[PDB]
Structure 1
Amino acid sequence: NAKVAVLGASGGIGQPLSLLLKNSPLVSRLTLYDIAHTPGVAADLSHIETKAAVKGYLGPEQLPDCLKGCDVVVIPAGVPRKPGMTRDDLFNTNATIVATLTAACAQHCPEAMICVIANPVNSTIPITAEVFKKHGVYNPNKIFGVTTLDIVRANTFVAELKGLDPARVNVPVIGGHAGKTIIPLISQCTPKVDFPQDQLTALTGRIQEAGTEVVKAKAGAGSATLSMAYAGARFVFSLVDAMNGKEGVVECSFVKSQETECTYFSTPLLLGKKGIEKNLGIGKVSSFEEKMISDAIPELKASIKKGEDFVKTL
């Protein structure tokens, strides 16, 4: 009976993500928010033969109604990358979008789980946390930077190389969601896979630049939308299952962390009724992986500080 709000529901990620949420038996209310086209999207989705009651909200003054009583808020809202761009090129747009939307959450559903998809996640999660702090409703266990697409890609690519079914493969991916901050722990993969170093390096790079590959392939028509909707759905389903009492629910996510010198970090998380039940940490890693962690730290801390300073100067 979860009520889930989707902020940015009319966008490229928003529309398919809303479809996947509408199709789920875990959702009973699905409220949709955007600044255009939301009523047509809700009308469209409300015809689908599932129990979730759908409502489309349009414009800032309707945002409180969309958020009230929400258990989960997903935020796919944001401008997508075009060819050549870094995710940080979209910092200024998406930071103001994330700060505005998360401020509305802090006021109107402070208790809800906040799942941020909007990039750069390495900065937008710090932004979300600081905004909740300013409203005095800060709960580190309920703020999630959705990195699930990195895990999803890692599983697919390992499966392809080893001729496995991607559904049966699980690769923990830690760090953050940008370039070399994306650290796939192939040493912790289930099933165990043995790659020689040249293939491991090629596989790791592929995972790290996978978003850029899609941007390139779309040749100006944006970034990952459909696979991001899949990954976004997956994480929200994991979270809702855990909120309903399902045990042993583990997902990697970029959260307020105590695992490294970074105040924010993605690790495997045991999920439960109050969000993060336990941070499972990095665990045992190879020299290759340890070296990637070390090299990721400066960029992560820089991205965190940029997110923090953006909010603190509002």
Structure 2
Amino acid sequence: NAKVAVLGASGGIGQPLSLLLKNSPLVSRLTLYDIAHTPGVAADLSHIETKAAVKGYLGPEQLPDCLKGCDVVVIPAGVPRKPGMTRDDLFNTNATIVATLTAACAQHCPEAMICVIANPVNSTIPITAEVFKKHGVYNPNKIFGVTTLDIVRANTFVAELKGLDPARVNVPVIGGHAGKTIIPLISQCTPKVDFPQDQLTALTGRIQEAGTEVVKAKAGAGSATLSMAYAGARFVFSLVDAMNGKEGVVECSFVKSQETECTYFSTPLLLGKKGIEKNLGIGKVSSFEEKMISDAIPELKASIKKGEDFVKTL
């Protein structure tokens, strides 16, 4: 079974994400990293009656030990938004956080699956790749920008409008994770759904700005933590099931891609033992959906460039 490392385990996302991972029979070893509180979070989780052995590591001195033999590394670490902030306002802090932590992964568990939640994902994935490139252990099949929350939100909002059980809805979401770059493919939704354009546009904008909606609702107490923990655990479970030989596992994720002109893009991915087995690509989309893909590419390029430029300055 899998050894999973959580970098930033003591934060708002990290604690409940670590709880969901500990509850899973797919995990046998769970290592927790942060700069504060980890030993306490680990002692807490270690009492839970599941097989996953839990250990907390504190400070960069113990970071190498945390990473040894890891099959998957999830990185919820990062500063959350306050009302008013854009995801780009977090770029500077989260870029150096992701740069520092992915360097440690490249040095200590370069063969591991790397799942980045830290925002803005549209720049932090490029950063992760370039950091891995500079260490000479670059593998684009094992680096994932976790955009799963966008799919989870689309499913819920569609299900609510159509009176369906969200657990049986699937809405592909492509592009990236910002405004802007979030493209819900309602045309490719299962079960098949039918919305008027004004209702479709409202639904689309709702999915696009759902992160901001939660920031407003929290009124300065941060951004999505619990739903983000759910989405992160879902993606890790999908990846680990696939690594154990489960067939047909498809998740959208922001990865190194030659699907569009963007070197990085989020599409549905067939997962497996090497990570990305096959990029299933964008597929058949509406004219409305195609317009969005075109409007988003400009921003994606900037975000990719910004992230790549940041690594060169190091």
Report the TM-score, using the length of structure 1 for normalisation.
1.00
Return the alpha-carbon distance in structure 2 between the equivalents of residues 298 and 8 of structure 1.
31
Return the alpha-carbon distance in structure 2 between the equivalents of residues 90 and 296 of structure 1.
20
Return the alpha-carbon distance in structure 2 between the equivalents of residues 283 and 180 of structure 1.
20
The one-character-per-residue Cα deviations of 1:30-86 (angstroms, maximum 9, x if unpaired) are 000000000000000000000000000000110000000000000000000000110
Deviation at 1:94, TM superposition (A): 0.2
Return the alpha-carbon distance in structure 2 between the equivalents of residues 275 and 307 of structure 1.
23
1:137 matched to 2:124? The reply is no
SS of corresponding position for 1:179: coil
SS of corresponding position for 1:78: coil
Which residue pairs with 2:216 in the alignment? 216
Return the alpha-carbon distance in structure 2 between the equivalents of residues 176 and 123 of structure 1.
10
Deviation at 1:312, TM superposition (A): 1.0
Deviation at 1:207, TM superposition (A): 0.1
Return the alpha-carbon distance in structure 2 between the equivalents of residues 84 and 204 of structure 1.
21
Deviation at 1:107, TM superposition (A): 0.2
The one-character-per-residue Cα deviations of 1:186-214 (angstroms, maximum 9, x if unpaired) are 00000000000000000000000000000
Unaligned runs of 5+ in 2: none
SS of corresponding position for 1:193: coil
Return the alpha-carbon distance in structure 2 between the equivalents of residues 75 and 196 of structure 1.
39
Deviation at 1:152, TM superposition (A): 0.2
Deviation at 1:149, TM superposition (A): 0.1
SS of corresponding position for 1:99: helix
Deviation at 1:313, TM superposition (A): 1.1
Deviation at 1:283, TM superposition (A): 0.1
Deviation at 1:235, TM superposition (A): 0.1
Return the alpha-carbon distance in structure 2 between the equivalents of residues 84 and 275 of structure 1.
37
Deviation at 1:305, TM superposition (A): 0.2
SS of corresponding position for 1:283: coil
Which residue pairs with 1:12 in the alignment? 12
The one-character-per-residue Cα deviations of 1:247-305 (angstroms, maximum 9, x if unpaired) are 00000000000000100000000000000000000000000000000000000000000
Return the alpha-carbon distance in structure 1 between the equivalents of residues 244 and 251 of structure 2.
16
SS of corresponding position for 1:83: coil
Q: Which portions of structure 1, spanning 4 or more consecutive aligned residues, are displaced by more than 6 angstroms? A: none
Deviation at 1:224, TM superposition (A): 0.1
The one-character-per-residue Cα deviations of 1:204-248 (angstroms, maximum 9, x if unpaired) are 000000000000000000000000000000000000000000000
Return the alpha-carbon distance in structure 2 between the equivalents of residues 123 and 207 of structure 1.
21
Deviation at 1:141, TM superposition (A): 0.2
Return the alpha-carbon distance in structure 2 between the equivalents of residues 245 and 88 of structure 1.
38
Which residue pairs with 2:77 in the alignment? 77
Return the alpha-carbon distance in structure 2 between the equivalents of residues 105 and 239 of structure 1.
18
Return the alpha-carbon distance in structure 2 between the equivalents of residues 65 and 183 of structure 1.
39
Deviation at 1:20, TM superposition (A): 0.1
Once the two structures are superposed, the pairs formed by residues 30-45 of structure 1 within 5 Å of their partners are 30-45=30-45
The one-character-per-residue Cα deviations of 1:98-145 (angstroms, maximum 9, x if unpaired) are 000000000000000000000000000000000000000000000000
Unaligned runs of 5+ in 1: none
Return the alpha-carbon distance in structure 2 between the equivalents of residues 127 and 39 of structure 1.
29
Deviation at 1:153, TM superposition (A): 0.1
Q: State the identity %.
A: 100
Return the alpha-carbon distance in structure 1 between the equivalents of residues 170 and 196 of structure 2.
19
Return the alpha-carbon distance in structure 2 between the equivalents of residues 313 and 261 of structure 1.
25
Return the alpha-carbon distance in structure 2 between the equivalents of residues 49 and 7 of structure 1.
23
SS of corresponding position for 1:153: helix
SS of corresponding position for 1:266: strand
The one-character-per-residue Cα deviations of 1:11-43 (angstroms, maximum 9, x if unpaired) are 000000000000000000000000000000000
Once the two structures are superposed, the pairs formed by residues 1-314 of structure 1 within 5 Å of their partners are 1-314=1-314
